[PDB]
Write a protein that binds this ligand. Structure first.
Ligand SMILES: C[S@@+](CC[C@H](N)C(=O)[O-])C[C@H]1O[C@@H](n2cnc3c(N)ncnc32)[C@H](O)[C@@H]1O
Ligand SMILES: C[S@@+](CC[C@H](N)C(=O)[O-])C[C@H]1O[C@@H](n2cnc3c(N)ncnc32)[C@H](O)[C@@H]1O
Ligand SMILES: Nc1nc2c(c(=O)[nH]1)N[C@@H](C(=O)O)CN2
Ligand SMILES: Nc1nc2c(c(=O)[nH]1)N[C@@H](C(=O)O)CN2
Ligand code: SF4
Ligand code: SF4
Ligand code: NA
Ligand code: NA
Ligand code: NA
Lengths: 209, 209
């Protein structure tokens, strides 16, 4: 059984796949924050820009099995078009994403991406693994396709991340009252340490979901 | 001998490599437009957003040979950092980019990207080939890494471009008085035909060179 906040079709706004059409499957619930504003100030992850509480968003609900969920995800794809691509996110998707859902998505022709905080083991049959490490959480996922680090966070050991086994190393400016400041910081970081590339949250500039 | 408008260090704003630190080598001169405003209305390519006239920009000039040009390019890279990457553009870079410059850049440890209008044969030893076809010009480069089509253009057979031999197919909104309009058209195009992905001119949103 899957608790899903929302499912929607848009362009991936972030990371190496920015600009790519994708169905987003946003799972409800996270292991680093309750999602309640009352808890934010004491949480492990305190800067979250997302509503992942409950199953009341667009196409959200409790799905009784993988087939039900895949049917809804598939239904959002343009008729007759291939290149099916789904981004599993949340919330922390690895609280719920399992091999049966991965297998059912694959059998429906989807390539699968995940957005994960890296504090939980990931299924390696997932096609595109994006890990976004939180400075005060364990990082147990040390290989993947892209490591997308939100900066700045206190306690961060940023240069150390570049030692890990990823294809791409990205910094993403932390949105909030200092987004423009953080964007300049991020640009400067990449220019000084060009192993790193910039990940903009482009959907916020394009004003799309 | 090379006529170079400007050379500068920044992040690639466009295409699949958007966000990546790069030295931009902007060659002076193009074969589809003189670069003069009085000629724009009659040019083969009429929507250009770039100044490629003369050799008077930052680090711009007339370079004696490949070694002199590579020296200036390499000089802009952060000392002791690898991942060297140069984007050859202009102007139309294939008017000037030759094998000795490519070989010299490679010997200096640079990966080489090109931004080309596709009307001239390209050097296939270039590491990253981005082709941006102009609807009223011939297209003689029909394979490469990314095909980044600026939209809308009159006379365009946009869907048909997808039959060419590229890894990525992108649409980029035409900047000018209708940028926001064209951005909406481009997003819609990708969502309708998800083989295509959106290429934003992110440097214009970030306000960086
Ligand atoms: C909402 S999280 C959900 C996926 C997973 N829980 C994670 O943290 O990777 C999706 C992405 O948004 C990023 N993000 C969250 N809050 C952000 C903020 N205020 N500014 C920028 N990126 C943010 C996260 O780091 C992550 O890369
Ligand atoms: C200035 S051109 C130089 C390289 C070569 N002349 C070409 O056209 O590809 C660099 C890139 O900017 C794109 N471009 C030019 N004018 C533009 C505009 N008004 N809006 C959006 N992209 C534009 C071109 O299509 C090309 O992809
Ligand atoms: N367009 C778009 N892209 C996104 C997001 C989002 O909310 N919209 N959210 C991010 C996420 O929550 O995973 C990833 N990329
Ligand atoms: N940052 C940045 N990226 C660019 C450009 C530019 O002017 N700035 N110009 C484009 C070009 O003229 O090739 C390609 N990408
Ligand atoms: S770990 Fe991801 S989903 Fe959870 S609070 Fe942090 S950014 Fe939000
Ligand atoms: S072909 Fe490229 S450089 Fe030449 S006018 Fe068009 S966009 Fe500008
Ligand atoms: Na989000
Ligand atoms: Na330009
Ligand atoms: Na058209």
């Amino acid at each position: 059984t899957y608790a899903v906040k929302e499912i929607f079709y848009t362009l991936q706004g972030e990371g190496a796949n920015a600009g790519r059409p994708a169905v987003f499957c946003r799972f409800a619930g996270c292991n680093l924050w309750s999602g309640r504003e009352e808890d934010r100030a004491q949480a492990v992850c305190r800067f979250c820009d997302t509503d992942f509480v409950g199953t009341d968003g667009e196409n959200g609900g409790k799905f009784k099995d993988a087939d039900a969920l895949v049917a809804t995800i598939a239904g959002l794809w343009p008729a007759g078009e291939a290149h099916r691509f789904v981004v599993c996110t949340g919330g922390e998707p690895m609280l719920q994403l399992d091999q049966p859902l991965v297998d059912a998505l694959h059998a429906a022709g989807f390539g699968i991406a995940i957005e994960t905080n890296g504090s939980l083991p990931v299924l390696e049959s997932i096609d595109w693994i994006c890990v976004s490490p939180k400075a005060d959480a364990p990082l147990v996922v040390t290989k993947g396709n892209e490591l997308k680090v939100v900066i700045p966070q206190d306690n961060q050991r940023l240069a150390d991340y570049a030692k890990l086994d990823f294809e791409y190393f990205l910094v993403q400016p932390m949105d909030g009252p200092s987004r423009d400041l953080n964007t300049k910081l991020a640009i400067d970081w990449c220019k000084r340490h060009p192993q790193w590339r910039l990940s903009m949250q482009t959907h916020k500039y394009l004003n799309i979901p």
